[PDB]
Amino acid sequence: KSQIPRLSAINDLHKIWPTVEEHGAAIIESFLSLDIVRRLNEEVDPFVKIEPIPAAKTKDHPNHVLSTTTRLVNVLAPISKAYREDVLNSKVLHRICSDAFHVYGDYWVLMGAVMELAPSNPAQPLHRDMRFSHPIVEYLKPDAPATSINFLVALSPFTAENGATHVILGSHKWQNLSNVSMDATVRALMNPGDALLITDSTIHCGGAETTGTETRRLLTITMGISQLTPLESNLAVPRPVIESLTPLAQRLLGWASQRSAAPRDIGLLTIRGNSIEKTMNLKAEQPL
Amino acid sequence: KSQIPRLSAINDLHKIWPTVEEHGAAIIESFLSLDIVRRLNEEVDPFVKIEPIPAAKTKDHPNHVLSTTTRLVNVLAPISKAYREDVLNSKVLHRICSDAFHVYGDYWVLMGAVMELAPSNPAQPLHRDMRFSHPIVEYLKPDAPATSINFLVALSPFTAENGATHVILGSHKWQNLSNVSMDATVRALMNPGDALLITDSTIHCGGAETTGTETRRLLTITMGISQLTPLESNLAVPRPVIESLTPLAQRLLGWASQRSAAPRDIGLLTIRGNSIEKTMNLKAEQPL
Numbered sequence: 001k002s003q004i005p006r007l008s009a010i011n012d013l014h015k016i017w018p019t020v021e022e023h024g025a026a027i028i029e030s031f032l033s034l035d036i037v038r039r040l041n042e043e044v045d046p047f048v049k050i051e052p053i054p055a056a057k058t059k060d061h062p063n064h065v066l067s068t069t070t071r072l073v074n075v076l077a078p079i080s081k082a083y084r085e086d087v088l089n090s091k092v093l094h095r096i097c098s099d100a101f102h103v104y105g106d107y108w109v110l111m112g113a114v115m116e117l118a119p120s121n122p123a124q125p126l127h128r129d130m131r132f133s134h135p136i137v138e139y140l141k142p143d144a145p146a147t148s149i150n151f152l153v154a155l156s157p158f159t160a161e162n163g164a165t166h167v168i169l170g171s172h173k174w175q176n177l178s179n180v181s182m183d184a185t186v187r188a189l190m191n192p193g194d195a196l197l198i199t200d201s202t203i204h205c206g207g208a209e210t211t212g213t214e215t216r217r218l219l220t221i222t223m224g225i226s227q228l229t230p231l232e233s234n235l236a237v238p239r240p241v242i243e244s245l246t247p248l249a250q251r252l253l254g255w256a257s258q259r260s261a262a263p264r265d266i267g268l269l270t271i272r273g274n275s276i277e278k279t280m281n282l283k284a285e286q287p288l
Numbered sequence: 289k290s291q292i293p294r295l296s297a298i299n300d301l302h303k304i305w306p307t308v309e310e311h312g313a314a315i316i317e318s319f320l321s322l323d324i325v326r327r328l329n330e331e332v333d334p335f336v337k338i339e340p341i342p343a344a345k346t347k348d349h350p351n352h353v354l355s356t357t358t359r360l361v362n363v364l365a366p367i368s369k370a371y372r373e374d375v376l377n378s379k380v381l382h383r384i385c386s387d388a389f390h391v392y393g394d395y396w397v398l399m400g401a402v403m404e405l406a407p408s409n410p411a412q413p414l415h416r417d418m419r420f421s422h423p424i425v426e427y428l429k430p431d432a433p434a435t436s437i438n439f440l441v442a443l444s445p446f447t448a449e450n451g452a453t454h455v456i457l458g459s460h461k462w463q464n465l466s467n468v469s470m471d472a473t474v475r476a477l478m479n480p481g482d483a484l485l486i487t488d489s490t491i492h493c494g495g496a497e498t499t500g501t502e503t504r505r506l507l508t509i510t511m512g513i514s515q516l517t518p519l520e521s522n523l524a525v526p527r528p529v530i531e532s533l534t535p536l537a538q539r540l541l542g543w544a545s546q547r548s549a550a551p552r553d554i555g556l557l558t559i560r561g562n563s564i565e566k567t568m569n570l571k572a573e574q575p576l
């Protein structure tokens with residue numbers, strides 16, 4: 001059966017979104033450089049090691065869906081310099097997102113998370129994202145343009161044996177989900193820095209870790225229209241960190257007003273006709 | 289033709305949402321007491337007088353849709369004690385909203401605004417709300433439960449001659465909008481404190497001010513599911529003001545995490561499995 005289309009981030013930039021819209025998935029080879037992956041991993045390392053189980057009883061908002069052998073750490077801007085600078089300002093990410101969301105308007109990060117799966121982590125059930133946070137998305141018309149997309153960036157090797165992601169190609173256009181079976185999937189085999197890009201309608205799942213030794217890690221970046229509420233908050237991020245970012249990165253983290261694509265757009269998160277950034281006199285690119 | 293159903297806030301509380309869902313509109317008599325209206329008006333008075341035209345060239349996010357004889361002031365929590373305490377904690381408002389949005393989950397304020405229309409303000413064109421800020425809503429299925437509702441609270445008398453709101457009853461279920469005509473409307477005649485409640489699909493418009501002397505004022509409260517981004521931001525509201533509010537009011541203004549109605553909800557605006565309010569140790573009901 002047909003494999004997931006593979007595209008260069010360097011040469012095939014304009015082909016990436018059209019490919020995903022047609023097939024429901026694409027692999028962006030070298031989405032992040034090996035340098036950025038190294039720094040990213042180094043910076044988040046301790047935070048994933050201290051992370052408790054998804055549904056730990058200490059948590060206000062426990063995640064009862066993810067397996068107990070999953071560690072997910074979000075709100076990465078205060079943790080990681082590589083994330084807040086390099087990936088939040090990724091030229092490739094921003095071309096794809098503007099390609100994807102131009103019908104709606106501004107987009108932002110719904111969640112940037114590092115996921116690490118312990119050895120022998122079981123396969124996830126096949127699913128579409130967004131159904132445990134945004135019930136609204138299920139009420140969208142079948143042909144409505146995708147309101148969110150997910151970059152699953154490999155931070156270690158994705159192999160068949162260590163639980164590389166499964167996708168069902170074309171499943172983003174499925175209405176009837178009775179064809180849903182692991183029999184219909186193909187794998188996202190990836191080197192560190194490659195990204196699997198899917199939509200909120202692409203049926204997919206984490207793979208079974210079968211070696212019993214390897215630890216698979218990924219950076220999942222759910223980008224979505226600014227009209228939908230993020231899964232994570234950057235409200236508690238220190239102001240010196242926010243003010244070190246570019247204006248674009250600030251907007252992505254909810255530290256700016258937003259705009260819809262409506263011809264006479266009246267805006268989102270505004271303050272009596274003025275933006276957040278003006279009202280709070282928020283500075284940008286102030287180094288730490 | 290059939291007039292807008294009128295309901296008591298005291299006796300008919302459970303009938304209000306069912307009435308709106310059937311007819312697209314209802315008048316809630318004495319939604320706010322005359323005392324609350326007085327305090328509200330007194331507190332916002334100067335802020336509406338200093339408010340420039342909707343599309344003033346000083347503005348970052350000008351509103352090019354509203355007439356030049358309209359003054360709209362939003363982000364009312366820092367301006368008005370009556371708003372932040374009395375209306376944000378309105379028992380009637382919260383019963384109606386939980387009735388309306390239970391399929392989706394938590395709801396919050398998309399915009400709380402005082403609108404004041406100058407004498408001889410023209411009638412607005414018939415419209416549905418949300419189309420200049422949330423293009424996503426037009427892509428919802430026809431029978432999807434309303435994702436936002438609008439309380440248009442009279443802060444002065446609404447009469448036929450001074451531009452009382454027009455609605456088309458049943459128009460919230462319309463797909464074909466060729467029957468749209470001022471011929472099909474009825475008026476929301478209201479005393480101060482009464483509220484016209486409509487959905488995001490109800491076709492309506494501000495009326496023509498024909499006396500040339502009267503100034504009509506209203507408080508419009510767009511309540512919507514927490515999965516949709518507010519039109520206004522409370523990010524710049526002083527922390528002592530936020531900490532004076534109830535936990536419920538804090539959530540309504542985006543100063544708390546939110547929950548969807550999904551059985552294993554994973555939450556909105558969370559921080560590594562914990563809420564905003566915990567992470568920032570946000571206090572509540574600390575008087576000023």
Ligand SMILES: CN1C(=O)c2ccccc2NC(=O)[C@@H]1Cc1ccccc1
Binds near residue numbers: 063113124129130554
């Ligand atoms: C539940 N869930 C997450 O927690 C998650 C994690 C990372 C990025 C996106 C994301 N969004 C989701 O909707 C998923 C869906 C899911 C996960 C496992 C098993 C079944 C369904």
Ligand SMILES: CN1C(=O)c2ccccc2NC(=O)[C@@H]1Cc1ccccc1
Binds near residue numbers: 354413418420
């Ligand atoms: C544009 N517009 C607002 O500005 C507005 C004002 C108050 C509360 C809600 C609200 N939302 C809206 O979508 C309206 C829609 C509109 C207004 C006038 C003429 C045509 C359409």
Ligand SMILES: O=C(O)CCC(=O)C(=O)O
Binds near residue numbers: 124152164205207
């Ligand atoms: O583990 C993976 O590769 C996919 C994870 C995923 O799809 C999810 O958690 O939503």
Ligand SMILES: O=C(O)CCC(=O)C(=O)O
Binds near residue numbers: 412440454492493495
């Ligand atoms: O003026 C009114 O009564 C209605 C105003 C309105 O519908 C709007 O501005 O969206």
Ligand code: NI
Binds near residue numbers: 127128
């Ligand atoms: Ni997933």
Ligand code: NI
Binds near residue numbers: 415417493
């Ligand atoms: Ni309106």
